[PDB]
Design a protein around this ligand. Structure first.
Ligand SMILES: [Ca+2]
Length: 223
Protein backbone atom coordinates (compact mmCIF):
# COMPACT_ATOMS: atom_id res chain seq x y z
CA UNK A 1 0.00 0.00 0.00
CA UNK A 2 1.38 3.38 -1.05
CA UNK A 3 0.31 6.45 0.83
CA UNK A 4 -1.66 4.59 3.54
CA UNK A 5 -1.34 4.17 7.29
CA UNK A 6 -0.53 1.48 9.84
CA UNK A 7 -3.83 -0.39 10.40
CA UNK A 8 -3.16 -1.47 13.98
CA UNK A 9 -2.58 -5.06 15.03
CA UNK A 10 -5.50 -7.40 14.23
CA UNK A 11 -7.83 -4.48 13.34
CA UNK A 12 -8.50 -6.11 9.97
CA UNK A 13 -9.32 -9.61 11.28
CA UNK A 14 -10.25 -11.12 7.89
CA UNK A 15 -6.89 -10.20 6.33
CA UNK A 16 -4.70 -13.18 5.60
CA UNK A 17 -1.13 -13.57 4.35
CA UNK A 18 -0.38 -16.28 1.79
CA UNK A 19 3.05 -17.78 2.59
CA UNK A 20 5.24 -20.08 0.45
CA UNK A 21 8.38 -19.53 2.54
CA UNK A 22 7.68 -15.79 2.51
CA UNK A 23 4.64 -13.57 2.16
CA UNK A 24 3.60 -13.31 -1.48
CA UNK A 25 -0.05 -12.26 -1.61
CA UNK A 26 -3.01 -11.27 0.53
CA UNK A 27 -6.42 -12.98 0.94
CA UNK A 28 -9.68 -12.64 2.83
CA UNK A 29 -11.18 -15.15 5.26
CA UNK A 30 -14.84 -15.73 4.25
CA UNK A 31 -15.63 -18.56 6.65
CA UNK A 32 -13.79 -20.83 9.03
CA UNK A 33 -12.41 -23.03 6.19
CA UNK A 34 -12.20 -20.78 3.10
CA UNK A 35 -10.10 -17.88 1.83
CA UNK A 36 -10.67 -15.75 -1.27
CA UNK A 37 -7.69 -14.37 -3.12
CA UNK A 38 -6.63 -13.42 -6.65
CA UNK A 39 -6.15 -16.15 -9.25
CA UNK A 40 -2.86 -14.54 -10.27
CA UNK A 41 -1.65 -15.42 -6.74
CA UNK A 42 -2.04 -19.19 -7.48
CA UNK A 43 0.83 -21.50 -6.63
CA UNK A 44 1.28 -24.81 -4.84
CA UNK A 45 2.60 -25.16 -1.29
CA UNK A 46 0.46 -22.37 0.21
CA UNK A 47 0.29 -21.87 3.97
CA UNK A 48 -2.43 -19.46 5.02
CA UNK A 49 -1.43 -17.17 7.88
CA UNK A 50 -4.28 -15.71 9.88
CA UNK A 51 -4.14 -13.27 12.80
CA UNK A 52 -1.00 -11.58 11.50
CA UNK A 53 0.30 -8.08 12.09
CA UNK A 54 4.10 -8.25 11.87
CA UNK A 55 4.65 -11.02 9.32
CA UNK A 56 8.23 -11.47 10.51
CA UNK A 57 7.61 -11.80 14.27
CA UNK A 58 5.44 -14.31 16.17
CA UNK A 59 3.28 -11.95 18.27
CA UNK A 60 0.74 -14.42 19.66
CA UNK A 61 -2.53 -14.26 17.63
CA UNK A 62 -1.35 -16.22 14.59
CA UNK A 63 -2.92 -19.32 13.12
CA UNK A 64 -0.93 -21.04 10.39
CA UNK A 65 -2.97 -23.56 8.33
CA UNK A 66 -1.99 -25.34 5.13
CA UNK A 67 -4.21 -25.23 2.09
CA UNK A 68 -5.85 -28.56 1.26
CA UNK A 69 -7.24 -27.39 -2.10
CA UNK A 70 -7.04 -24.38 -4.41
CA UNK A 71 -9.70 -23.49 -7.04
CA UNK A 72 -8.91 -20.90 -9.66
CA UNK A 73 -12.02 -19.43 -11.27
CA UNK A 74 -13.06 -21.57 -14.28
CA UNK A 75 -12.77 -18.61 -16.64
CA UNK A 76 -9.61 -16.96 -15.30
CA UNK A 77 -7.52 -15.45 -18.12
CA UNK A 78 -4.01 -14.62 -16.98
CA UNK A 79 -3.34 -12.41 -20.02
CA UNK A 80 -6.28 -10.00 -19.44
CA UNK A 81 -6.75 -10.76 -15.73
CA UNK A 82 -10.47 -11.22 -16.34
CA UNK A 83 -11.96 -13.32 -13.49
CA UNK A 84 -8.92 -12.77 -11.21
CA UNK A 85 -10.28 -14.76 -8.30
CA UNK A 86 -9.51 -18.01 -6.53
CA UNK A 87 -10.71 -19.96 -3.50
CA UNK A 88 -8.49 -21.72 -0.99
CA UNK A 89 -9.77 -24.35 1.39
CA UNK A 90 -7.90 -24.78 4.68
CA UNK A 91 -6.87 -28.23 5.94
CA UNK A 92 -8.54 -27.42 9.24
CA UNK A 93 -11.06 -24.81 10.38
CA UNK A 94 -9.70 -21.58 11.78
CA UNK A 95 -10.67 -20.59 15.32
CA UNK A 96 -12.88 -17.48 15.11
CA UNK A 97 -12.64 -14.73 17.77
CA UNK A 98 -12.28 -10.89 17.60
CA UNK A 99 -8.79 -10.91 16.03
CA UNK A 100 -9.57 -13.64 13.46
CA UNK A 101 -12.88 -13.28 11.76
CA UNK A 102 -14.63 -13.86 8.46
CA UNK A 103 -15.81 -10.97 6.26
CA UNK A 104 -19.34 -10.92 4.82
CA UNK A 105 -19.83 -11.41 1.09
CA UNK A 106 -21.90 -8.74 -0.72
CA UNK A 107 -25.61 -9.31 -1.41
CA UNK A 108 -25.46 -6.20 -3.61
CA UNK A 109 -22.67 -4.58 -5.64
CA UNK A 110 -21.05 -1.33 -4.59
CA UNK A 111 -21.35 1.95 -6.46
CA UNK A 112 -18.93 4.74 -7.35
CA UNK A 113 -18.26 7.08 -4.43
CA UNK A 114 -18.52 4.48 -1.66
CA UNK A 115 -15.47 4.63 0.68
CA UNK A 116 -13.65 1.31 1.15
CA UNK A 117 -10.75 -0.09 3.18
CA UNK A 118 -7.90 -1.71 1.26
CA UNK A 119 -5.15 -3.45 3.18
CA UNK A 120 -1.95 -5.48 2.76
CA UNK A 121 1.80 -5.99 3.22
CA UNK A 122 2.69 -4.78 -0.29
CA UNK A 123 5.26 -2.20 -1.43
CA UNK A 124 4.87 1.23 0.20
CA UNK A 125 6.84 3.19 -2.46
CA UNK A 126 5.72 4.24 -5.96
CA UNK A 127 9.28 4.91 -7.08
CA UNK A 128 11.57 2.27 -5.62
CA UNK A 129 10.90 -0.46 -3.08
CA UNK A 130 10.14 -0.85 0.65
CA UNK A 131 8.14 -3.74 2.04
CA UNK A 132 6.56 -3.30 5.50
CA UNK A 133 6.47 -5.86 8.27
CA UNK A 134 3.12 -4.65 9.71
CA UNK A 135 -0.25 -4.42 7.95
CA UNK A 136 -0.93 -1.18 6.03
CA UNK A 137 -4.34 0.30 5.28
CA UNK A 138 -5.86 2.79 2.82
CA UNK A 139 -9.30 4.32 2.67
CA UNK A 140 -10.29 4.88 -0.94
CA UNK A 141 -13.42 5.43 -3.00
CA UNK A 142 -14.78 3.42 -5.82
CA UNK A 143 -14.44 5.27 -9.13
CA UNK A 144 -17.02 5.48 -11.90
CA UNK A 145 -17.01 2.87 -14.63
CA UNK A 146 -16.40 5.62 -17.16
CA UNK A 147 -13.31 7.08 -15.41
CA UNK A 148 -12.05 3.50 -14.98
CA UNK A 149 -12.39 2.80 -18.70
CA UNK A 150 -10.89 6.21 -19.59
CA UNK A 151 -7.83 5.45 -17.46
CA UNK A 152 -7.44 1.99 -19.02
CA UNK A 153 -8.90 1.94 -22.56
CA UNK A 154 -9.96 -1.48 -23.82
CA UNK A 155 -8.90 -3.28 -20.60
CA UNK A 156 -11.74 -2.98 -18.07
CA UNK A 157 -14.30 -5.82 -18.09
CA UNK A 158 -17.60 -6.08 -16.25
CA UNK A 159 -15.68 -8.14 -13.67
CA UNK A 160 -13.38 -5.23 -12.73
CA UNK A 161 -13.74 -1.88 -11.02
CA UNK A 162 -11.37 0.97 -10.22
CA UNK A 163 -10.80 2.44 -6.79
CA UNK A 164 -8.45 5.06 -5.52
CA UNK A 165 -7.32 8.54 -6.55
CA UNK A 166 -6.64 9.82 -10.06
CA UNK A 167 -4.23 12.47 -8.68
CA UNK A 168 -1.75 9.77 -7.64
CA UNK A 169 0.04 9.01 -4.41
CA UNK A 170 -2.42 6.56 -2.75
CA UNK A 171 -2.94 3.02 -4.07
CA UNK A 172 -2.37 -0.67 -3.49
CA UNK A 173 0.80 -2.21 -5.01
CA UNK A 174 2.85 -5.38 -5.58
CA UNK A 175 2.46 -7.69 -2.60
CA UNK A 176 -1.09 -6.47 -1.79
CA UNK A 177 -2.51 -8.63 -4.62
CA UNK A 178 -5.28 -11.01 -3.58
CA UNK A 179 -6.15 -8.87 -0.53
CA UNK A 180 -9.40 -7.18 0.46
CA UNK A 181 -11.42 -4.18 -0.54
CA UNK A 182 -14.16 -3.87 2.10
CA UNK A 183 -17.01 -1.36 1.80
CA UNK A 184 -19.59 -0.94 4.55
CA UNK A 185 -18.48 -4.25 6.03
CA UNK A 186 -18.72 -6.28 2.79
CA UNK A 187 -15.96 -7.77 0.65
CA UNK A 188 -16.48 -5.87 -2.63
CA UNK A 189 -13.08 -6.24 -4.27
CA UNK A 190 -9.83 -8.14 -4.60
CA UNK A 191 -6.52 -6.38 -5.28
CA UNK A 192 -5.82 -7.32 -8.90
CA UNK A 193 -3.74 -5.00 -11.13
CA UNK A 194 -2.77 -1.43 -12.18
CA UNK A 195 -0.05 0.30 -14.16
CA UNK A 196 2.72 0.82 -11.63
CA UNK A 197 1.52 1.97 -8.20
CA UNK A 198 -0.03 5.34 -7.16
CA UNK A 199 0.66 6.88 -10.56
CA UNK A 200 -1.40 9.79 -11.79
CA UNK A 201 -4.42 8.66 -13.87
CA UNK A 202 -3.60 4.97 -13.21
CA UNK A 203 -5.84 3.91 -10.34
CA UNK A 204 -6.05 0.47 -8.76
CA UNK A 205 -8.06 -2.23 -10.58
CA UNK A 206 -10.01 -4.71 -8.44
CA UNK A 207 -11.88 -7.94 -9.05
CA UNK A 208 -15.65 -7.24 -8.71
CA UNK A 209 -16.59 -9.75 -5.99
CA UNK A 210 -20.37 -9.26 -6.21
CA UNK A 211 -20.30 -10.99 -9.63
CA UNK A 212 -18.84 -14.11 -8.03
CA UNK A 213 -20.98 -14.77 -4.96
CA UNK A 214 -23.06 -17.49 -6.65
CA UNK A 215 -19.89 -19.29 -7.75
CA UNK A 216 -18.31 -18.88 -4.31
CA UNK A 217 -21.35 -20.28 -2.46
CA UNK A 218 -21.88 -23.26 -4.75
CA UNK A 219 -18.17 -24.09 -4.70
CA UNK A 220 -18.11 -24.06 -0.88
CA UNK A 221 -21.29 -26.15 -0.84
CA UNK A 222 -19.68 -28.95 -2.85
CA UNK A 223 -16.04 -29.00 -1.63
CA1 LIG B 1 3.35 -12.45 13.13
Amino acid sequence: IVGGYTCGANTVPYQVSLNSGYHFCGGSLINSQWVVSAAHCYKSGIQVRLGEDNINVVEGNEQFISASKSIVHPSYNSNTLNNDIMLIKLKSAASLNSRVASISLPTSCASAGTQCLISGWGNTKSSGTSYPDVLKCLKAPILSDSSCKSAYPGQITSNMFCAGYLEGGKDSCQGDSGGPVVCSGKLQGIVSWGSGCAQKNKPGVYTKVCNYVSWIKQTIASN
